[PDB]
Design a protein around this ligand. Structure first.
Ligand SMILES: *CCC(=O)Nc1cccc(Nc2cccc(OCCCCC)c2)c1
Ligand SMILES: *C(=O)CCCCCCCCCCCCC
Lengths: 195, 211
């Protein structure tokens, strides 16, 4: 699963409704060397290189998305649902990167809620960046999915989830993107990152 | 009249804004340099500028001035013209404080734009802190992201003020403060820039954006 003893992703969708899901995770994982994807994110402070060093290594995951772009709007949303057995306040940083430069950093806070003898963190129907909405509307124009893939090889997201009070890193997920077909809806493959 | 006297509405007032750098020496004898600074501690109607005149200086489609102005409310839109002081490996930071009569979760987006295209964007949320009968939203000492720090380091090495001014002619910043829960826009500030002259520190002029 995508998670640690301390925090687990329970669900993630980005979608549009005027529900079409561009990407959806509902909840022995393969390994990939983090060195392979250093040049996908900025090398300054808050870079994958210097984040993995600080540890803990077991908290770093890669998610590859085959996004469904078959659907001017519209409400454009992200929904995330995390859970834990300990009571925490989360800070969720999302850095949208184009050619390894950060073009958007979005910083959210979510306080734990008690539900069925576990703590849930609901960041539901958060409005998508104006930048992603515009990018999506242009991406959908492209005549060929090989062109959509060419444009996405340079487009990445890094989401760092911290224990607010302690600053302890809990989850670091790198996201990479291609496009799926219609008959073959959104798909993903979650990997663990190792050095 | 109900025309703004400062940068704020009845729902949300800027208290203080500043971009600064603290030299490494700051730990020994404290000092900070203000690139720009707005203080509305203790206060005539503001002047008006037609938002159409600056459309092409900001991004387009979703979250471009024209669409933001279209969604409204029209009284929440301001233009700040900064004369930045560029005469100073330190700490580059941004501090903002807003006040409200009501309890809200604010979302704050800052969009750095070059020739009118979005380049770099920072989005933060701040929950209300209830103090002396009113709520305060404090976003103090946000690290300046590395694009603005590289930009400042380059701009300051230019041989001539007129060249700094020509570069800054195509450098703008759009700030949208929304009620995170309801999505209603509270405050939209467009920033245009020039250099000030070494002996004059940072200065600013605030305008109402009209149409
Ligand atoms: C570098 C991207 C980023 O994070 N920018 C950022 C972050 C928080 C707040 C702001 N706002 C802002 C608004 C007006 C002026 C500012 O700096 C002035 C320096 C430029 C003078 C030439 C910053 C931006
Ligand atoms: C910006 O508003 C922050 C959003 C951060 C999470 C985005 C998750 C991925 C978006 C899915 C759509 C991309 C398909 C190419």
């Amino acid at each position: 699963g995508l998670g640690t003893a301390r925090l687990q992703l329970v669900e993630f969708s980005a979608f549009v409704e005027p529900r079409h899901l561009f990407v959806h995770i509902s909840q022995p994982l393969e390994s990939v060397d983090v060195r392979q994807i250093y040049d996908k994110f900025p090398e300054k402070k808050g870079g994958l290189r210097e984040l993995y060093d600080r540890g803990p290594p077991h908290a770093f995951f890669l998610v590859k998305f085959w996004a469904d772009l078959n659907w001017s709007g519209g409400f454009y949303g992200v929904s995330s649902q995390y859970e834990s057995l300990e009571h925490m306040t989360l800070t969720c940083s999302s850095k949208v990167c184009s050619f390894g430069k950060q073009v958007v950093e979005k910083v959210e806070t979510e306080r734990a809620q008690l539900e069925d003898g576990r703590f849930v963190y609901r960041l539901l129907r958060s409005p998508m960046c104006e930048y992603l909405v515009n990018f999506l509307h242009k991406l959908r124009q492209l005549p060929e999915r090989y062109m959509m893939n060419s444009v996405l090889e340079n487009f990445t997201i890094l989401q760092v989830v911290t224990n607010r009070d302690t600053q302890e890193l809990l989850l670091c997920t790198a996201y990479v993107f291609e496009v799926s077909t219609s008959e073959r809806g959104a798909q993903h493959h979650i990997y663990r990152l190792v050095r």
